[PDB]
Amino acid sequence: SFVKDFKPQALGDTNLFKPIKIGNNELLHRAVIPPLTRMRALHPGNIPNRDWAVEYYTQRAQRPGTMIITEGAFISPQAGGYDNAPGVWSEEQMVEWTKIFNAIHEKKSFVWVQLWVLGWAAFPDNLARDGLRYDSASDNVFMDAEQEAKAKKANNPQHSLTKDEIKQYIKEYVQAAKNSIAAGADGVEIHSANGYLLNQFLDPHSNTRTDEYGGSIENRARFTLEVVDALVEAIGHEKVGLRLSPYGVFNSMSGGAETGIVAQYAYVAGELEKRAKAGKRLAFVHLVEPRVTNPFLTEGEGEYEGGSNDFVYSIWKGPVIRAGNFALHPEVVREEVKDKRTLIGYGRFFISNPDLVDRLEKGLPLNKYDRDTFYQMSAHGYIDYPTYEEALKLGWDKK
Amino acid sequence: SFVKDFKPQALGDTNLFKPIKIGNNELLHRAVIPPLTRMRALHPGNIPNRDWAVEYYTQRAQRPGTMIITEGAFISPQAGGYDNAPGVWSEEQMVEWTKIFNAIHEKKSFVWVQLWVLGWAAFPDNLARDGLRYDSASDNVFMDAEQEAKAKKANNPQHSLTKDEIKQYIKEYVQAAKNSIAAGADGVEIHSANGYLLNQFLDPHSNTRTDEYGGSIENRARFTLEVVDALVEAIGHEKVGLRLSPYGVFNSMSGGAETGIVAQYAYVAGELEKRAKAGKRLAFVHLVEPRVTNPFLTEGEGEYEGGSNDFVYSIWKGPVIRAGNFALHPEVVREEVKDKRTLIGYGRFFISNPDLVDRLEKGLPLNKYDRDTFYQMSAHGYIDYPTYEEALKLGWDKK
Numbered sequence: 001s002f003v004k005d006f007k008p009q010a011l012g013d014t015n016l017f018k019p020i021k022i023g024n025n026e027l028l029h030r031a032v033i034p035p036l037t038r039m040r041a042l043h044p045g046n047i048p049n050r051d052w053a054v055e056y057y058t059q060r061a062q063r064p065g066t067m068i069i070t071e072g073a074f075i076s077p078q079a080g081g082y083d084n085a086p087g088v089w090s091e092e093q094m095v096e097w098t099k100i101f102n103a104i105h106e107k108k109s110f111v112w113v114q115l116w117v118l119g120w121a122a123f124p125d126n127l128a129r130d131g132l133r134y135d136s137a138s139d140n141v142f143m144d145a146e147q148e149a150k151a152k153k154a155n156n157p158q159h160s161l162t163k164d165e166i167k168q169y170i171k172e173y174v175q176a177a178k179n180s181i182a183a184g185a186d187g188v189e190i191h192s193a194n195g196y197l198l199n200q201f202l203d204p205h206s207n208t209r210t211d212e213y214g215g216s217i218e219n220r221a222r223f224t225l226e227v228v229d230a231l232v233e234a235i236g237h238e239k240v241g242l243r244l245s246p247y248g249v250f251n252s253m254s255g256g257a258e259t260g261i262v263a264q265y266a267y268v269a270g271e272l273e274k275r276a277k278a279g280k281r282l283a284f285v286h287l288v289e290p291r292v293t294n295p296f297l298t299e300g301e302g303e304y305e306g307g308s309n310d311f312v313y314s315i316w317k318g319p320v321i322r323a324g325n326f327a328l329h330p331e332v333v334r335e336e337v338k339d340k341r342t343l344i345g346y347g348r349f350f351i352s353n354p355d356l357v358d359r360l361e362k363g364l365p366l367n368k369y370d371r372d373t374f375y376q377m378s379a380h381g382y383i384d385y386p387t388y389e390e391a392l393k394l395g396w397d398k399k
Numbered sequence: 400s401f402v403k404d405f406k407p408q409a410l411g412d413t414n415l416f417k418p419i420k421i422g423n424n425e426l427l428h429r430a431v432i433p434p435l436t437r438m439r440a441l442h443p444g445n446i447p448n449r450d451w452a453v454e455y456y457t458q459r460a461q462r463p464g465t466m467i468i469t470e471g472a473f474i475s476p477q478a479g480g481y482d483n484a485p486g487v488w489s490e491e492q493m494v495e496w497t498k499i500f501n502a503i504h505e506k507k508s509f510v511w512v513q514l515w516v517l518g519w520a521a522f523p524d525n526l527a528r529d530g531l532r533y534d535s536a537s538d539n540v541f542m543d544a545e546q547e548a549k550a551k552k553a554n555n556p557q558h559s560l561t562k563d564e565i566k567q568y569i570k571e572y573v574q575a576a577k578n579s580i581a582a583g584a585d586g587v588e589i590h591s592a593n594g595y596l597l598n599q600f601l602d603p604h605s606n607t608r609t610d611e612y613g614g615s616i617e618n619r620a621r622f623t624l625e626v627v628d629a630l631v632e633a634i635g636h637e638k639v640g641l642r643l644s645p646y647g648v649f650n651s652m653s654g655g656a657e658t659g660i661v662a663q664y665a666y667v668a669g670e671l672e673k674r675a676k677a678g679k680r681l682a683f684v685h686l687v688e689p690r691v692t693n694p695f696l697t698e699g700e701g702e703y704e705g706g707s708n709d710f711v712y713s714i715w716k717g718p719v720i721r722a723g724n725f726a727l728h729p730e731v732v733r734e735e736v737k738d739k740r741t742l743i744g745y746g747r748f749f750i751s752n753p754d755l756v757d758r759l760e761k762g763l764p765l766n767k768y769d770r771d772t773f774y775q776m777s778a779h780g781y782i783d784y785p786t787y788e789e790a791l792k793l794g795w796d797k798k
């Protein structure tokens with residue numbers, strides 16, 4: 001059924017429907033599909049779903065000129081820890097990704113692979129089973145007691161990365177990005193947000209290191225910028241984006257409670273602009289808004305009102321993708337896209353509306369999403385959400 | 400005469416005329432007199448003008464409940480270098496300051512002493528004459544070639560402060576603040592803005608040190624926060640404010656050209672909020688707007704459009720005084736004071752309008768200022784600017 005109390009507003013008369021170039025891609029509108037983990041990848045081997053993934057991405061690429069960022073993809077087994085998320089390290093995986101990229105391109109849309117490393121958000125028992133470390137920035141602070149428990153139970157205690165193991169990750173990032181481009185992706189997005197490994201280095205709560213990767217703003221940012229630099233070198237700045245969530249508390253990050261948090265993220269932004277003036281401007285910076293500090297809370301919950309992402313705009317002068325509770329708030333989007341370098345990521349509603357761009361353009365009702373099938377091993381709640389046309393035929397307007 | 404093309408707007412219906420408590424002072428409106436150097440202090444001894452200073456401050460205290468921040472005052476001879484700016488280190492000086500504070504208090508207004516240390520903006524020849532160092536953060540970078548010349552000529556080359564000399568300044572800040580309070584001031588403002596000594600430590604262009612006072616965001620901020628801490632300890636957090644100019648280029652600071660500049664200032668703001676949650680919240684943070692990057696350029700010139708001070712609001716949760724080209728833009732002030740903790744500093748127009756608050760309240764014409772007498776040794780352009788009543792009597796409406 002449709003979202004019951006929603007008062008849609010057509011956005012076709014706004015900059016949301018003005019074309020923009022991001023990296024090498026000529027977007028025809030600025031509604032972006034942000035990275036959305038769906039847990040349909042098959043085990044063993046973290047293989048993109050051979051039955052459903054192509055169709056899923058095809059449906060969502062249906063509006064020509066759409067920028068799609070994939071679900072997080074592990075760069076290596078050690079970077080993983082969820083059996084049903086995809087990876088981009090093996091030939092098996094890339095064969096399925098190539099089919100996906102081809103289908104999106106045939107719909108005249110674009111695809112960026114999000115490169116994902118879990119750190120302490122990984123399941124230590126899964127890792128222990130596969131002979132892998134349970135990794136984070138530090139070893140004296142844990143995500144929650146449960147995760148700290150599972151580690152000890154699985155005899156896989158949280159391990160503070162040595163400098164050589166960090167380098168190994170950087171090498172894996174490099175190879176995963178090369179794999180992505182070679183298989184046909186338009187670019188990659190470095191996931192440095194939402195409390196995953198890179199974020200665990202950025203945040204002073206999770207990073208209590210005293211070597212050059214912790215103890216200061218510059219140090220905590222080091223790992224992230226090294227990945228950025230390694231990837232810009234490997235496949236070019238025009239094929240690299242960065243995702244950040246300055247106010248996020250997901251996976252036990254500090255958010256606005258940390259008084260130094262804006263300074264931490266402002267520094268990263270500064271360093272990106274620095275590289276941009278020196279000839280190497282990233283394709284985009286992708287920001288999670290304080291509008292959503294946890295995307296598994298219903299829209300309007302977990303909103304942080306004490307901080308704004310606007311600071312990034314004073315520092316980084318390139319494209320900015322903003323994501324978080326925008327689908328139900330076209331009145332907000334209308335204002336934000338008045339800025340000419342701002343794009344809008346729509347997450348949960350792109351899950352449930354394959355034709356979302358049309359619906360935004362024309363102010364059509366939205367399909368409700370089903371949180372129960374966000375992470376299910378099923379076609380249901382994945383590829384069976386109807387377009388508006390199909391929804392009408394199913395009588396959804398009269399439910 | 401009156402400002403010719405100005406279209407005044409009454410502001411009495413805005414928060415500019417709502418009372419607010421700053422430190423121990425109950426302000427009755429939020430139009431603040433920012434620090435304004437006028438060079439009427441007498442030489443020798445940097446003594447507040449015995450003929451004119453009381454009358455000057457009296458005229459400008461005339462609206463009850465007005466917060467006045469004094470012209471910059473040197474904390475020590477070594478901190479000085481302009482013969483006609485006042486100091487707050489000697490008994491001679493404090494006797495004149497006491498008369499000033501008394502007169503302001505009799506008008507039911509308030510007075511905060513700005514504590515000033517010149518660093519490389521000082522005249523090295525004046526200092527050499529008095530046997531004093533020409534001080535800055537570093538010795539391999541100079542304000543301009545002229546100042547670098549005068550130093551060498553006066554055999555007083557720019558001197559990079561040792562850690563002991565920095566401590567000596569901190570001691571002088573402490574004593575100057577104690578002197579101010581003892582003489583009757585409501586508080587002090589630490590001048591960490593506009594390219595003076597503390598700013599020279601904050602800015603990566605002027606600070607090329609490799610010890611703990613330079614080389615990183617935290618290090619460059621060290622001197623400023625030490626002063627803050629020493630003064631909060633000495634006279635209380637409710638009697639201490641801080642002035643900053645994140646986008647300023649005055650006296651050869653970097654401004655927005657430096658990609659790390661927001662991060663530098665965000666860190667300072669964070670540290671202040673940190674102390675604020677730990678029980679020691681400064682009375683206010685005072686910000687120079689990118690609206691004015693140089694107050695000796697006419698209004699509208701030297702405006703930086705690539706950056707905003709709004710970031711401070713996501714980090715510091717206390718009162719914020721904002722200054723820069725607000726007098727001729729009531730349409731801007733109307734919006735900014737909708738924030739309930741925002742005050743507006745009016746500089747050049749408080750120079751030329753002793754009754755400025757009334758004129759803002761009622762939307763009256765403004766007296767033009769005379770830049771030629773900003774720094775003159777004269778009553779003219781100091782205490783002879785007319786109130787609106789006097790201006791009418793002089794026929795200023797018919798000029």
Ligand SMILES: Cc1cc2nc3c(=O)[nH]c(=O)nc-3n(C[C@H](O)[C@H](O)[C@H](O)COP(=O)(O)O)c2cc1C
Pocket residue numbers: 034035036037038071072114191193194243288292295296323324325326327345346347348349374375
């Ligand atoms: C089911 C689900 C899976 C997600 N997976 C990812 C992910 O893999 N990588 C990522 O950076 N963000 C992920 N997110 C966060 C979203 O990209 C987005 O920031 C969030 O949903 C807020 O946007 P929205 O209000 O439009 O849904 C996910 C969110 C949801 C609800």
Ligand SMILES: Cc1cc2nc3c(=O)[nH]c(=O)nc-3n(C[C@H](O)[C@H](O)[C@H](O)COP(=O)(O)O)c2cc1C
Pocket residue numbers: 433434435436437470471513590592593642687691694695722723724725726744745746747748773774
């Ligand atoms: C003549 C003059 C003297 C000033 N003296 C000081 C000073 O001693 N300390 C300080 O922090 N700012 C000083 N300033 C900067 C002002 O406080 C203020 O930030 C600036 O004038 C911008 O505000 P406005 O546009 O309202 O004039 C001075 C400005 C002028 C024009």
Ligand SMILES: O=C1CCC=C1CO
Pocket residue numbers: 037072193194250295
């Ligand atoms: O970032 C991710 C990956 C899976 C869920 C989230 C939350 O945003």
Ligand SMILES: O=C1CCC=C1CO
Pocket residue numbers: 436471592593649694
């Ligand atoms: O800061 C000061 C002191 C004298 C002039 C300025 C410019 O703002």
Ligand SMILES: [Mg+2]
Pocket residue numbers: 392393395
């Ligand atoms: Mg029907």
Ligand SMILES: [Mg+2]
Pocket residue numbers: 791792794
């Ligand atoms: Mg008349």
